[PDB]
Design a protein around this nucleic acid. Sequence first.
DNA 1: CGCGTACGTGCGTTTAAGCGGTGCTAGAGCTGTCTACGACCAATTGAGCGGCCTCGGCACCGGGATTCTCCAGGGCGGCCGA
Length: 288
Amino acid sequence: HDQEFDPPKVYPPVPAEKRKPIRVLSLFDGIATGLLVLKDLGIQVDRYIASEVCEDSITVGMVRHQGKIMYVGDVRSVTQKHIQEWGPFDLVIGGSPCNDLSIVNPARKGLYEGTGRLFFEFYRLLHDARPKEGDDRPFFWLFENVVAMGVSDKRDISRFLESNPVMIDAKEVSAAHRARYFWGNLPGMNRPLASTVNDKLELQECLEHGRIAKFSKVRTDQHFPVFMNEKEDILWCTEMERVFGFPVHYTDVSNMSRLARQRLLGRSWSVPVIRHLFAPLKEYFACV
DNA sequence: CGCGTACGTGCGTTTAAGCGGTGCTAGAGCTGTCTACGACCAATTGAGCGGCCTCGGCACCGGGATTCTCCAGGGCGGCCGA
Ligand SMILES: Nc1ncnc2c1ncn2[C@@H]1O[C@H](CSCC[C@H](N)C(=O)O)[C@@H](O)[C@H]1O
């Protein structure tokens, strides 16, 4: 599909003597997957600012990052003054809530409802955190969304962000079936999925003991995908974290139920997919 | 109103009820003898019943513990549908 045409801006590599840690703005953070991947790659983080509403996700971040995260409330409360007073950013990330962007809803409300239009909030903060002309600072940005969108919606998003959406499927690097569009200007945006041997490709490596995988991988019949003691059992939450690439026992931070952990892990990013995406940032920024 | 199961019908098979015989004998049934067991009569007396009394066991008011009843809330999926 060639509807628009624009070259991706490739920044020159900075040497090690002018190497600086990253300043990261994370708009729709949720479960703090971005800072988790950044800490796993061994990258020094000078400032991480997450604008999260949901208190369970804020609790996930406060437990798993120990007060490193600077919290904002709603993204509508962020102005241009808040962007220009919190220093210039080096990495902007986010994925808008796809309640009305997904075409799996028969009665979907579209891009221009209060769940979808938050994307434009992103664009506004994309417009504020972007450096002006004449500044050769390497500025990188990343937007995530689902594959189940309309043609006009994806076309308008691609025109607004001015980048080619690469499609990445979790089955090439992890044990999940979800294809996601990624807008951004990272180097090697469409390079193939370098599967890490430490990543759990099959489903059975993500299971616990005493459980047999019925399928080869899981999706995002009135049965259950795991047999347990010759009985079909629901897929566990820690096993869901191992499928989604998270560390073991990650989203157990408060007194939330099983349904809350499902709602948090469903909306979260895939750790291996991000690790692939954030990989070339290591040569552009600080290392630890 | 739907599921099923288990009962009724029919046919073949066969077990034994019924009828017809006789032989025998334990026992129902009738007869004579008498004896011992109960009705009938009087005296007597002591046990049982009318009357009384007093008192303690039962009925009853009140209070607290308790003991079951029931509904409100908190968490919990869960179920969608707008
Ligand atoms: N107006 C808003 N501003 C900021 N966050 C919001 C928001 N509305 C909802 N959110 C929260 O932000 C998250 C966006 S949903 C997708 C999250 C993202 N893909 C991830 O990496 O986890 C949701 O968890 C939702 O609870």
